[PDB]
């Protein structure tokens, strides 16, 4: 929420400058590899019908956001778990020493993991997380919502990701880095610092997506 405003400000700033209206666009000049995200959502599934949204992060961990506002995370050692109650109460469990209080939720989470692992592609497969801050911790899904054109994912670390259904283009916005990772229809990705896009500009496609982005942040912000 404090971070959504940072983003909002950042997007207001880059959109306000009409990046695609420069006499000459020098998009490659806005690139900044030192900003590459650490985590993003590589794949997801929706059971918000009877349970919730299951998703996998880039580092292969799997997480679930249940309709009852609780989150269960399974780290990539296929065993360590972290349950997060609505009030924010965090607690550690292990699938090896599978509890009794969450057997149902662990079995569900195991079903999603198997499903995402059998049918789903891994977004950003060709991206390499950066050697970012080490005191930073793995984020969980804060909240998500869909539109007719895209899905919007809000991560506890401040990042917001928008996956567009039709063309498969994605955006990964980080208010801490003040950068945007764009993944075009050809699966090629690039990271830019928003202030630089403000200076050098960008193409029509990235710009309309940054306008749609301020819109979705506004929706996240007023909910």
């Amino acid at each position: 929420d404090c971070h959504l405003s940072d983003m909002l400000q950042q997007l207001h700033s880059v959109n306000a400058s009409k990046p695609s209206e420069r006499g000459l666009v020098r998009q490659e000049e806005a690139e900044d590899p030192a900003c590459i995200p650490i985590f993003w959502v590589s794949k997801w599934v929706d059971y918000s019908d009877k349970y919730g949204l299951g998703y996998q992060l880039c580092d292969n961990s799997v997480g679930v956001l249940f309709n009852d506002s609780t989150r269960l995370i399974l780290y990539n050692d296929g065993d360590s778990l972290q349950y997060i109650e609505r009030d924010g109460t965090e607690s550690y469990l292990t699938v090896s020493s599978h509890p009794n209080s969450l057997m149902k939720k662990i079995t569900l989470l195991k079903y999603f993991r198997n499903y995402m692992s059998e049918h789903l592609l891994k977004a950003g497969a060709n991206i390499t997380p950066r050697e970012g801050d080490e005191l930073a911790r793995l984020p969980y899904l804060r909240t998500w919502f869909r539109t007719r054109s895209a899905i919007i994912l809000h991560l506890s670390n401040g990042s917001v990701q928008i996956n567009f259904f039709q063309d498969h283009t994605k955006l990964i916005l980080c208010p801490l880095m003040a950068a945007v990772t764009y993944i075009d229809e050809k699966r090629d990705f690039r990271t830019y610092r928003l202030s630089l896009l403000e200076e050098y500009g960008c193409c029509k496609e990235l710009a309309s997506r940054l306008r749609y982005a301020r819109t979705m942040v506004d929706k996240l912000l007023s909910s």
């Binding site: 794949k43 997801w44 929706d46 995402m116 592609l121 977004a123 498969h168």
Partner: peptide, 6 residues
């Protein structure tokens, strides 16, 4: 869609 890209 109900899940991300296959």
């Amino acid at each position: 869609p109900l899940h991300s890209t296959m």
